[PDB]
Design a protein around this ligand. Structure first.
Ligand SMILES: NCCCSC[C@H]1O[C@@H](n2cnc3c(N)ncnc32)[C@H](O)[C@@H]1O
Ligand SMILES: NCCCSC[C@H]1O[C@@H](n2cnc3c(N)ncnc32)[C@H](O)[C@@H]1O
Ligand SMILES: NCCCSC[C@H]1O[C@@H](n2cnc3c(N)ncnc32)[C@H](O)[C@@H]1O
Ligand SMILES: NCCCSC[C@H]1O[C@@H](n2cnc3c(N)ncnc32)[C@H](O)[C@@H]1O
Lengths: 292, 292, 292, 292
């Protein structure tokens, strides 16, 4: 095949996908933006040269990010997303019947406009009256406003030094900006980077341990995302408990979410939060904490 | 970082590993045989241009291939391996104290002799008095010998038309050749190809469904193998039940297996054997059966 | 710099060009047709996954293909092009004031229509009253029409077994079909494939030797084409001598050709027609003759 | 094919060769050193990630670099090489019957040792009593010693800012270090980088113009080197004339060089020094000069 997008995932690992076209290439002051039409994963959003969403498997990422957090809440009504410009986290949140307000707070208007325009899947979401789009740094936005939320969702890029996301994974940020803005019984969830057998030590274990230092209950979980070329991680965090069985998750899904989930049922969530021996022990032994 | 090993996982997806060296390249009349020293995965055995074992994570594959089968057996004493010339399957079998004899039946003497010399991790295994190496087609060997086994392990390449491995995945094979050479309570396990969200439809679902036509109890399961760049699958099959808890499995590990498993504990197996919603249902609805 | 067009020049040599866009991809039943906007070479026409014309250097190929033949002719008035659907060969022919008619005979109407729409450099050429476009196999066309030409231009793909172009490079073709349709003093020129130090043995030496069996005077010549990643070759053939000095050629350029050539002057042609020691001798000693 | 060496030749152009092995990888304080066994070009020396010599076509580079300069001299006896660690420039120089002394002055002992050991072709050269190996910066070595030479050969890497070679292409270096150390009737030749239709403006035109400002007679010439993925350039420079015909070159070769040249005869040299229209005009119009 002639045409390829190439991504260096580590300094010694490259991942190449065959291309149909290069649909749109924008840029803002924040990052490079690109929509590719790829053979293996369909349409793909690439930010600063990292694939961040692919048409074929974004559903897995977005179901996993969103649904566990809301299903463990007794009655989630309002939710604040840090990031979300791609719009699929909002789509999945808006599937919940209890939800009356979703704030998408992304720093990059152009990403939003771009995806608002070209990720057709998210059109019903982007137009729902419950969605409020806010163009800001989520950290500034959070400390600015007094509104408190049932659920806060971190749908940011991994914490990389000198980037616009690193701040929002520090113990400082959690303790003093995020957690004050959680209602009673509030639940936080953040995307947490690679969660492979070896790749999980880069950011996942540290995000987990950083949250461990702020919240009473912390639940790491993971699932394969083919377009990310790895197992990916999320962490639920709360000062209230987080224990539903699979059966109780399935009941809650059937009652509270419109239409059928495609990836996530209760058993899948139970498998997801049962990390492997080595990962589970690695996380437990982690002592690094993100800080100022 | 300018020398790379490349593998086309699909016709539109390439995975590239930075190389330190090319330790050996060659061929038997069956297959090309190469050993690469890679940066991300250490020494990697590449057979017909497909990476089959990487030093850093082969433990995952071989622990998943071997331990669930033997652990589910009350008392496995004799095992036959279809393929296994690389030696790691034998290695993990020989960690079981209950085992008295392992037959490794590989068609290609050069794989065996090459791995016996170059894959040092398996040196003790290859030299264990309990191991018998037979150089033959596994199907011809099983047909021509009356010996029966407590466990038979399929460590062959994926089934396709016309390759030397296809006929060892058929309904007629399992029924007429393999099952008669299982002892009372015998367990079969085979590797079963990619088991990703979409890639599982190639062979994993068909192997599962084929086995489902021959054995009463069939347990498919899967785990990520980074050097294979996908979730990989295995299938257990038996005419006796295959239902142990994570705790039962741990006790058995502790009683029967020399040293600590690096990948697999009881929980990890339960997680591996709980497939995602989509994969589970796809397997259940599969109707392809491999036949002669 | 993460999207790339790749071409395997040989089974062990790849050339990759950074892409701006994929402007079109598709196919007729003859060939795939793609137009890529490349960084190093501008818009590149790719036919069956082989780059055939790049905006930045196609002038070299087409100047070398066309001008030496016409310049050596006392008075070329009518020309037939075998292939030429891309339009650049016609373009450079039509710069000659002496020309009254060009027949462009391409087998693939979709190449013609595509290039006529998308390769703007050739718009005037395509619209010139002197140009006739015929959609046919060039061999069938020449056989079935009595018209004779002062020059015939071979602008076909390289000869191999079974492709649509092979039979237009054979001894029997040149003798029985082409030569009878040359006027008195007629000159044949064909593109002749790679002409590198080693790559010239594939087809360039064989075309030269084949022509040497049919025509009295045969002048092979070559020039670097960066976007082809090699030296490329052409062969002039005639029953009348082909021996002009660099100065004679310049005077003719000045008298007959509208505008300045960007690549070819008289000296450049003399240089191109002086092959290296090794290539010269290899051509002289070649004995393969293409036959039906 | 599985294993590749990748070279970025421009920011938008990559060149990939299939690999047999990575024979040796050294490093010194000056550069990275590597010997690859490549499929398309055989054994290849790579310095700081740039291929600098390949077994299959180094003869072209080294014949072109060496023989024109000596053949234009009436009686060259002693020669100083700036660089030469690879040893092939010395090999070709030592083929001349008039030559009694060759100084190989390379800054990197390890390159020399490495090639002394592993480039078998140059064994007779490296052991010839006329060869003096000197481990130094050629600029310091030149200004240090009083010996004057009939021919000085620049076999350095292209002039790249902040590298150890840039100094040795400045007008200052030429005027005040190099030219004082040329005997009466002395001839200088330097390798001069890419000499393609467009690539020649990077260093070739500037090296040419810089020498033009120091020497009375300057002759640029070029030839394709497949392993360099380009036409490559050299420049002869002298205060005496440089005009032999092809015929006079061939006589001189037959009388003065042992054995047959494989690439270069008199006609080849004449073709080589007949640049194309555009290159010839580009060089003539160059006004940039390398300086302090
Ligand atoms: N794994 C999937 C991750 C998705 S890509 C990261 C997303 O979060 C936004 N973003 C980056 N920094 C941000 C900040 N400080 N505040 C709000 N949004 C931000 C960015 O514009 C982009 O939409
Ligand atoms: N990922 C797990 C695959 C590892 S590679 C496939 C292995 O099975 C052998 N093999 C192939 N066909 C065979 C046959 N009919 N009988 C015995 N061994 C065979 C082959 O020689 C090789 O060692
Ligand atoms: N580098 C110079 C090659 C350019 S690409 C080859 C061109 O010759 C046409 N073509 C192929 N076979 C043909 C035939 N038998 N008759 C007429 N045109 C033909 C084909 O449609 C295409 O336009
Ligand atoms: N196109 C083919 C070029 C060959 S590669 C450049 C060669 O010139 C040496 N070299 C680099 N800088 C040098 C200096 N200042 N003095 C002497 N040798 C040097 C370097 O160690 C190497 O052997």
């Amino acid at each position: 095949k002639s045409c390829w997008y190439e991504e260096e995932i580590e300094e010694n690992l490259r991942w190449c996908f065959a291309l149909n076209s290069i649909l749109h290439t924008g840029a803002s002051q924040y990052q490079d933006i690109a929509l590719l039409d790829t053979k293996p994963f369909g349409k793909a959003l690439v930010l600063d040269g990292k694939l961040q969403s692919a048409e074929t498997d974004e559903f897995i990422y977005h179901e996993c990010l969103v649904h566990p957090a809301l299903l463990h809440h007794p009655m989630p009504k309002n939710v604040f997303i840090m990031g979300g410009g791609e719009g699929s986290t909002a789509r999945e949140l808006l599937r919940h019947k209890t939800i009356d307000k979703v704030v998408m707070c992304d720093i990059d208007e152009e990403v939003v406009e771009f995806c608002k325009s070209y990720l057709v899947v998210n059109k019903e979401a982007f137009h729902d009256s419950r969605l409020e789009v806010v163009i800001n740094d989520a950290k500034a936005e959070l400390e600015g406003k007094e509104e408190k939320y049932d659920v806060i969702v971190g749908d940011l890029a991994d914490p990389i030094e000198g980037g616009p996301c690193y701040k929002l994974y520090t113990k400082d940020f959690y303790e003093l900006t995020l957690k004050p803005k959680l209602k009673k019984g509030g639940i936080f969830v953040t995307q947490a980077g690679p969660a492979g057998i070896f790749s999980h030590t880069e950011v996942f274990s540290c995000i987990y341990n950083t949250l461990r230092q702020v919240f009473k209950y912390v639940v790491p979980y993971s699932a394969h995302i083919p377009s990310y070329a790895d197992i990916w991680g999320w962490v639920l965090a709360s000062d209230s408990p987080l224990d539903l069985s699979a059966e109780e998750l399935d009941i809650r899904m059937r009652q509270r979410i419109i239409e059928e989930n495609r990836y996530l049922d209760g058993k899948t969530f139970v498998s997801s939060s049962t990390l492997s021996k080595a990962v589970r022990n690695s996380l437990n032994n982690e002592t690094h904490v993100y800080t100022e």
